[PDB]
Amino acid sequence: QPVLSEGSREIIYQDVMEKGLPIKAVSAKYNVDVRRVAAVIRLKEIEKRWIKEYKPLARPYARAVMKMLPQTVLGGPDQKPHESINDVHVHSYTTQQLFVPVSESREFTREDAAKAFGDHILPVDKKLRVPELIEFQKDLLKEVPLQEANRKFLNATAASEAKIAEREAKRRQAVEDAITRVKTDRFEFRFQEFNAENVGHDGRDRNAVGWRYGVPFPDRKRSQIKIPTKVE
Amino acid sequence: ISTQAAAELFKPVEGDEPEDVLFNSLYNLRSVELNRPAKYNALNGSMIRKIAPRLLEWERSDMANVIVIKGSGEKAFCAGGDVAALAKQNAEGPEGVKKSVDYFGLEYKLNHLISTYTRPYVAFLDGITMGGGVGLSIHAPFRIATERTVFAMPETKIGFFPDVGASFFLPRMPGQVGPYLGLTSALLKGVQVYYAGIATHYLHSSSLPALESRLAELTPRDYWTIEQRLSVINDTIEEFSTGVPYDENIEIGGKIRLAIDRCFKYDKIDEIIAALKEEAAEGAKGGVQSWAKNTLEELTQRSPTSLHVTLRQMRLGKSWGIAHTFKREHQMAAKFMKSHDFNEGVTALLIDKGANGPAKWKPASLDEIPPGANISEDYFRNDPEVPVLELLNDRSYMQYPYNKFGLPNDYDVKEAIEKGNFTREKLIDHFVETRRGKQGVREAVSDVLDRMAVRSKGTEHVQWKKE
Amino acid sequence: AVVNMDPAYMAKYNGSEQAAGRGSGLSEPPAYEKTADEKPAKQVIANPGRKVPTPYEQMTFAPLERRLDIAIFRA
Amino acid sequence: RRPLAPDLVVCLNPKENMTLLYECSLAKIPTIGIIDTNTNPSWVTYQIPANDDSLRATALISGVLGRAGERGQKRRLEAAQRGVVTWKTPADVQGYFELASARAADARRR
Amino acid sequence: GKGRIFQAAKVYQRASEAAATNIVSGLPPRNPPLWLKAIESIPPAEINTR
Amino acid sequence: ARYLANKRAAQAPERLDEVFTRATIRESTAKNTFVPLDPEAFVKAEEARIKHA
Amino acid sequence: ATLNQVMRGCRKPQRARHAVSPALSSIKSPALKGVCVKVGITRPKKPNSGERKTARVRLSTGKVITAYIPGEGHNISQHSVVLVRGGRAQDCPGVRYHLVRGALDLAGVATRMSSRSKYGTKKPKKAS
Amino acid sequence: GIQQITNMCSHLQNASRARLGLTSLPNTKYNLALALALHRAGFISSITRGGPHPPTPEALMTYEPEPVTSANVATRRLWVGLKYWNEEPVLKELKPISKPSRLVTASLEQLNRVARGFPAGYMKGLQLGECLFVNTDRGVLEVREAVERKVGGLVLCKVK
Amino acid sequence: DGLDDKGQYQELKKRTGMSVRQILQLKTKKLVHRRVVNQTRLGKIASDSVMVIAGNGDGWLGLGMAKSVEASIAVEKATLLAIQNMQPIPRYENRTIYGEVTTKVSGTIVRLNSRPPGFGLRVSHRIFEMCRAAGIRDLSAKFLRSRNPMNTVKATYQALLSQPNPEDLAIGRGKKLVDVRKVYYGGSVY
RNA sequence: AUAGAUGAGUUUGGUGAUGGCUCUGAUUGAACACU
RNA sequence: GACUAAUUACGUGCCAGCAGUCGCGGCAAUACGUAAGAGACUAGUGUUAAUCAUCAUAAAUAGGUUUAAAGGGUACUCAGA
Ligand SMILES: [K+]
Ligand SMILES: [K+]
Ligand SMILES: [K+]
Ligand SMILES: [Mg+2]
Ligand SMILES: [Mg+2]
Ligand SMILES: [Mg+2]
Ligand SMILES: [Mg+2]
Ligand SMILES: [Mg+2]
Ligand SMILES: [Mg+2]
Ligand SMILES: [Mg+2]
Ligand SMILES: [Mg+2]
Ligand SMILES: [Mg+2]
Ligand SMILES: [Mg+2]
Ligand SMILES: [Mg+2]
């Protein structure tokens, strides 16, 4: 599969950092998955660090390798989309073979299909990473001019990221309001508060705090993971 | 119309019986059975509100491939509507008159839906078929008659007019048979309904059960056009035919059929009756003296206003669309609720059951109406107080798209003669072969030639008598 | 695995047409009849890119692609 | 070439020859039969319940089906005169045309 | 059960399925039997029901 | 909330497409389960006595 | 059986199958030490033929069993302490045990090259 | 009791195996409850209470059954119309689950699991074509009609 | 092209109607091989009865069976019969069977179950060959009574030909059998 | 927790069944032999 | 040897021996011993012992009893279903 050329990576960096466009808009504009757009920015930010700290880039290695790989040029020539930004994950429940008996003239929609798989399952209309594309396509059906349809799409994505950025802000705040930082002569003691009564009806709760009693060491079991599983 | 829009438009009104209609569902067959045998399955608002939602719903299905309508008892399929109840409401001021206008609003929405139905529709005329029963059938591609069938339109007898789509079917029947059946309110029985053209097939009442169990087996392909589907059902109905009567002859044929074309070709009921007197006169070369005298004794009893209005719609309906027809009739029917003849004819004949003597129309007879009088235009003028009839769909047409499954008529025989150069006997075999041995083709085609065909070229060939 | 959903399809259809007929949609004439008719039947409504198999068998060794040493070799 | 098999079999006495009708079931060949009160109706595709022991009833049924075939052959040959073929080349002969052009295609270059 | 399995009532269903696709995957199906379209719209009648 | 939602569903109206498509079953068979005493139980018992005698 | 018959205890454990080496299976032991009461020869049954080197061992548990001596040539005799393991000689009746070759007194096959771990043979060390 | 439902299930199997167009059942509210669900699910063609002789075949729906009193309650019977499509009975198998010796009850979460084809309790998952009828406080329902109404109850039989 | 050096595919070329090159592209497999013996007036006569399957891998499967004094000849007889007895097998999304099926052949019961995509052919060795030849990719099988090599192939082949047809079950009951997985993704996701 | 359900050798002149045995999978607070 | 992935040569001659099951060895043994090769696991590898699963092989879920293990000699009956 092709790779984002060096020029394309820079274009993505300007639209998200300089022009301030939302990531969902740059994703839908260049057909680049939001997970890749967020990566191109992190990797570019690391280059600015090297260029600022006067570190030599592996330019000989970069050029020689990029010639070996197929590339897409975001901009003038829109030959093909870089990748499909609407790939939905196949949920286990949606994989079952169900033939539901219904009346001979029922309008069985995706909402009805989601409930036929489970009570908590959602239709693919809600499992998209850029769900604003549906509301954008519905505008075209209503003979809405393209220039106006694009306006509502930006305001829709720009407004969705505001809620996401607002949730994360309030989240991190609650994580700090629960920590009492007491500075001593040597270290800084962080007293995190929790509800010691949330241990489940039988004391076996996955999220309970404390070294559980009545369990020996699993250090002699096969397939026992003893290396870090998360570098945060 | 959406599913909820229909369920909300046909809410069960107070007084509706829960089982006026019985609905059955088989493999490919959906059945509608009128279930008021004590009243001869007479239509009413209660049962019209049960049929319309189903027909709209079965139309959204791909597994309902044949729709069959029929009656419950062995005596009647559908014997008119609840006109007796309409005469009472009309006597309760304008508030009661609109209730009647709303009834015809429902009845016409159903007939239009049947006429423009997008699935094969069959009607078992296994009993008397009058009034409302005619509207549920005539607009269908398949209309099966039996020895029990009795067709008639006794609307002019009660000071009314052929109401249910009759302004579209009768005007475009072969010859002047339309106006004759509508004005005189003639009564056809058995195979005569099949020779006239009201029915497309003729079976025996005992063969209908076996026919249904076969129609249910017919599983069409989704990609078959409506034409192919109607061809499969037409060939299936012709398998259960046990033959027409061996001795019963075409009633409206030959001399009588020729007289109808000469007497019912004018645009004034005064001239029509004048022509009938010539036939009834002694020495008339027509030879239908007995028939002409009988029809005269009938017209004198029919409402004189209904004759003018009826004869007027037969001449106008010939150029109307089917959708435009039900809308105009809804306006016409509204004027009859206000008129005096309708309320008198119904109250005198049906509510009184013939007691208190015969009816008393607004004019005592047709002689009271002077020549220059015009008592028809008043009924053909829309009333702004009566909202236009909103049909269940926007489909329409100027002529039935599929109405050539019956016997060949003057139109079919004419086209074959003006197109080809057949002979007397060769032409008859052209239809007996084209229809694949349909019972009655030889007798029908033979009759059409006896009237509208002469040896213009000698024994070599035959052409029309007109020119 | 994943499936591609075109927003243009989900905006115009709610999936009802996929349950027409007897539950699996309308039937199309066999292949030996389509080309016989000079007129090709209208394109059947469906999400673009359907009726193509997914190579599940080729993902037997996917868990190995998550190790750090392997990811370095794939980069 | 593989010998021909009938596209339709009209049996006037199914009860006496079930070997013929069973081979039609295996070969996927439709069949018509006169099913008498003691005959198994599952042996044919289209049943004609009737007395199969009378030569007068067998002649009528057979004659009626003979007229049906005659009436069908007349239409097929009438449509041909108008340039309308009511059938397509069978698969047996169809394949011959393909490999036949291949031999012509082989000599095309050579 | 000494009797044999007679599938005479399903000749069309069986023949139409065998003619739907080609045994050589990747090619259009050959022309079907000449009788397949003749009885396309003439299904068998129900039997054995009492 | 879990109670109201579950009680609402158990007492919800049937689907319209299920009403306009399901065949008819005469209420004389689908709802007449009660079996009352024969209204003529006394007249029949008096006639059965005469015939038995 | 009916639900009533099951409720009264119709389902019982299937009759036990005799183990290959009961002297070891009874006490869950993998091997047992014993003294050789007799070292002789046993004759196979109908199909096979030959002389099978067997030993009558008195296990430390008190049981007297007959063990098969695997390999070519042995060193044990009367009043010899040897280790016994499971596994039987299929063609010999009553020989339901084997002797370990790298045992206390029983020595491993000296001129053995293949499958030395089965016969308690040290590596020749000819290379070193 | 449940024994009548068990007899109704084995009888319909034998009537469909024999390819009978009609079949009679004892007239009980319990048999009527299961028959109405089979008719509501589309497995049978008709239900009519009548005498020891079947009503007129053609005029089956318009049949006028006489009132049921103590003078004829002993001779009443439920007449069922059976379906056969594609040379195969539409009601081939009727396997009971709850029997006189044991009444099997299922919860709402077990029925939700059996509806998608996963075993739960003494039941097994439903496959293509199979149906399951549960006797609940809201009447005899199909497992998918029960989970929709969010109720459990007594499991009657599995209809293939 | 000189592929048939013994004229063995000449008659098969007429019955089926495909070139020898297309015949060699089929997926054949000798499943069962029995050494049967018949006692005659002249002593024992041992034959080699074999069963062979043939398929395209895209919805066609055929079962052949023949015996002969030579093991090589029996494999050719069974192969010709397997290629001419091919039949179309219905598949759900061209990957699995419709629903569950259970067939019995003389004390050998086989139960085949449809499984979701990516489940694989978690079936025994002889069913893996038949599924891998017919084009099936997700299935679960189970022998309930007997594991007779011959009857396990006859029961498995008969089960693939007796799958519940949802198109017929719908017309029989007068109700749609909606393919939930098709409505959910707007089309068939093979 | 919705992916989780699998077989193989061996009785017969031969075939289909019945029915054990053994192997295939995982493991041990193990022991022994060669390392 | 087959189950079970992986071969030849020589020696031995129903002997010596191999063997979890079926089996192998009686003078031209891919089954024993040696040699080389090949197929595997690896600081472990094999073997013995044990447990679960295989085993719808004590079947509540979920079996069976005409001819293969298995219907009581009989049915009136308390308890029980
Ligand atoms: K009637
Ligand atoms: K067994
Ligand atoms: K043996
Ligand atoms: Mg006979
Ligand atoms: Mg032995
Ligand atoms: Mg070596
Ligand atoms: Mg013997
Ligand atoms: Mg090997
Ligand atoms: Mg060894
Ligand atoms: Mg060796
Ligand atoms: Mg280690
Ligand atoms: Mg006894
Ligand atoms: Mg005793
Ligand atoms: Mg005894």
Q: Which of B20, B163, B212, B344 is catalytic?
A: B163
Sheet holding I109-114, edge to edge: I100-104, I109-114, I139-143, I121-122
In angstroms, the CA D65 to CA D34 distance is 12
State both tokens at G82: 């040897």
What three-state secondary structure class fits G17? coil
**Residue G15 CA distance to nucleotide K52 C1' (Å):** 19
Q: Is H20 left (phi over 0), alpha (psi -120 to 50) or beta?
A: beta
Please check whether residue H73 is in contact with residue F35, taking contact to mean a CB–CB distance below 8 angstroms.
yes
**Residue from the list I18, I59, I87 with its beta carbon closest to the beta carbon of E24:** I18
Please check whether residue C23 is in contact with residue I177, taking contact to mean a CB–CB distance below 8 angstroms.
yes
State both tokens at D105: 């295609």
Sign of the dihedral defined by the CA atoms of residues E22, E24, E26, E27, in that order: negative
DSSP A33-91: -HHHHHHHHHHHHHHHHHHHTTPPP-HHHHHHHHTTS-EE--SS---S-SS-TTEEE--
Could you tell me where the beta strands, DSSP code E, fall in D1-110? 9-11, 31-35, 46-49
Q: Which residues pair with D31 in a beta bridge?
A: D9
A97-122 burial, b if ≥16 CB within 10 A, otherwise e?
A: bbbbbbbbbbbbbbebbbbbbeeebe
Question: Is B466 touching C (CB cutoff 8 A)?
Answer: no
Residues B23, F17: C-beta atoms closer than 8 Å? no
Q: How far is CA A34 from CA A90, B137, B295, in A?
A: 19, 63, 88
Please check whether residue D41 is in contact with residue D50, taking contact to mean a CB–CB distance below 8 angstroms.
no
In single-letter form, the type of residue at position F2 comes to: R
Helix/strand/coil (H, E, C) string of I72-85? HHHHHHHHHHHHHC
**Which residues, at least 6 apart from B101, have a Cβ–Cβ distance to it below 8 Å?**
B330, B333, B334, B337, B386
Residue in the structure block whose two tokens are 């060491």:
A217
Q: Which residues pair with H142 in a beta bridge?
A: H133
- According to DSSP, the β-strands at B142-145 and G52-59 are unpaired
Residue in the structure block whose two tokens are 């499969």:
B232
Please check whether residue I160 is in contact with residue I112, taking contact to mean a CB–CB distance below 8 angstroms.
yes
Please check whether residue C52 is in contact with residue I187, taking contact to mean a CB–CB distance below 8 angstroms.
no
- What residue has its CA nearest to the C1' of K16? G72
**Which residues, at least 6 apart from H91, have a Cβ–Cβ distance to it below 8 Å?**
H12, H16, H38, H43, H44, H82, H83, H159
In angstroms, the CA B157 to CA B354 distance is 12
Please check whether residue E25 is in contact with residue I58, taking contact to mean a CB–CB distance below 8 angstroms.
yes
A44-58 burial, b if ≥16 CB within 10 A, otherwise e?
A: beeeeeeeeeeeeee
In angstroms, the CA B276 to CA B132 distance is 30
**Residue B47 CA distance to nucleotide K3 C1' (Å):** 77
**Residue G120 CA distance to nucleotide J35 C1' (Å):** 12
In angstroms, the CA B26 to CA D37 distance is 29
State both tokens at A225: 């993971």
Please check whether residue A136 is in contact with residue A154, taking contact to mean a CB–CB distance below 8 angstroms.
no
Chain K bases near protein CB atoms (7 A cut-off): 14-26, 33-35, 45-50, 56-64, 80-81
- According to DSSP, the β-strands at I121-122 and I139-143 are parallel
Q: How far is CA I159 from CA G35, G50, I86, in A?
A: 64, 54, 15
CB atoms inside a 10 Å sphere around CB B388: 11
In angstroms, the separation between the Cα of residue A120 and the nearest Cα of chain H is: 12
Please check whether residue B193 is in contact with residue B199, taking contact to mean a CB–CB distance below 8 angstroms.
yes
H helix or E strand, kind and range, residue B168: helix B166-169
State both tokens at H102: 């044991």
Q: How far is CA B218 from CA B27, B65, B230, B234, I171, in A?
A: 9, 8, 11, 12, 11
DSSP state of H84: B
Q: Is C22 exposed, middle or buried (0-12, 13-18, 19+ CB in 10 A)?
A: buried
- G122 CB neighbours strand J below 7 A: yes
Please check whether residue C13 is in contact with residue A110, taking contact to mean a CB–CB distance below 8 angstroms.
no
Q: Is B49 exposed, middle or buried (0-12, 13-18, 19+ CB in 10 A)?
A: buried
Cα A116 to chain centroid, rounded: 28
Q: For B205, phi and psi rounded to 5 degrees?
A: -55, -25
In angstroms, the CA H71 to CA G124 distance is 107
What three-state secondary structure class fits G56? strand
Could you tell me where the beta strands, DSSP code E, fall in H70-113? 77-82, 94-96, 105-106
* SS percent in chain G: helix, strand, coil, step 5: 10, 25, 65
Nucleotide with minimal C1' distance from the CA of H116 is J2
What three-state secondary structure class fits A220? coil
B192-228 burial, b if ≥16 CB within 10 A, otherwise e?
A: bbbbbbbbbbbbeeebbeebbebbbbbbbeeebeeee
| Gyration radius (Cα) of chain A, Å | 25
**Which residues, at least 6 apart from A73, have a Cβ–Cβ distance to it below 8 Å?**
A5, A7, A8, A79
H helix or E strand, kind and range, residue F27: helix F27-30
In single-letter form, the type of residue at position B346 comes to: V
| Gyration radius (Cα) of chain B, Å | 22
Q: Which residues pair with G39 in a beta bridge?
A: G55
Q: Which of B80, B132, B175, B253 is catalytic?
A: B132
Cα B388 to chain centroid, rounded: 24
Q: Which of B20, B155, B344, B447 is catalytic?
A: B155
Please check whether residue B266 is in contact with residue B459, taking contact to mean a CB–CB distance below 8 angstroms.
no
Please check whether residue B20 is in contact with residue B4, taking contact to mean a CB–CB distance below 8 angstroms.
no
Q: Which residues pair with G59 in a beta bridge?
A: G34
Q: Considering only alpha carbons, which residue of chain A is nearest residue F18?
A: A103
Sign of the dihedral defined by the CA atoms of residues A153, A154, A156, A161, in that order: positive
Ligand 2 centroid, distance to I109 Cα (angstroms): 12
DSSP state of H123: B
**Cβ-Cβ contacts under 8 Å, D24 against chain E:** 8, 11
In angstroms, the CA A175 to CA A177 distance is 6
Could you tell me where the beta strands, DSSP code E, fall in B160-217? 187-189, 201-202
Let me know if B418 is a catalytic residue: no
**Which residues, at least 6 apart from D24, have a Cβ–Cβ distance to it below 8 Å?**
D6, D9, D30, D31, E8, E11
Q: How far is CA H8 from CA H26, H44, H57, H82, H93, in A?
A: 8, 13, 22, 14, 12
In angstroms, the CA H155 to CA A67 distance is 68
Q: Considering only alpha carbons, which residue of chain F is nearest residue A107?
A: F17
CB atoms inside a 10 Å sphere around CB H64: 9
State both tokens at D37: 């009160």
**Which residues, at least 6 apart from C46, have a Cβ–Cβ distance to it below 8 Å?**
C9, C18, I186, I187
Let me know if B440 is a catalytic residue: no
B249-286 burial, b if ≥16 CB within 10 A, otherwise e?
A: ebbbbeebbbbbbebbebeebeebbebbeebbeeeeeb
- What residue has its CA nearest to the C1' of K14? G49
Ligand 2 centroid, distance to B168 Cα (angstroms): 78
Question: Is D8 touching E (CB cutoff 8 A)?
Answer: yes
**Cβ-Cβ contacts under 8 Å, A106 against chain F:** 15, 17
DSSP state of D43: G
In angstroms, the CA B436 to CA B238 distance is 9
DSSP state of D55: H
CB atoms inside a 10 Å sphere around CB B446: 17
**Cβ-Cβ contacts under 8 Å, F44 against chain H:** 71
State both tokens at B216: 């249910």
Question: Is D2 touching I (CB cutoff 8 A)?
Answer: yes
What three-state secondary structure class fits B118? coil
In angstroms, the CA A72 to CA E10 distance is 56
Q: How far is CA A76 from CA A8, A30, A72, A73, A80, in A?
A: 11, 11, 11, 8, 12
H helix or E strand, kind and range, residue B291: helix B289-299
Chain breaks in chain D (C to N over 2.5 A) after: none
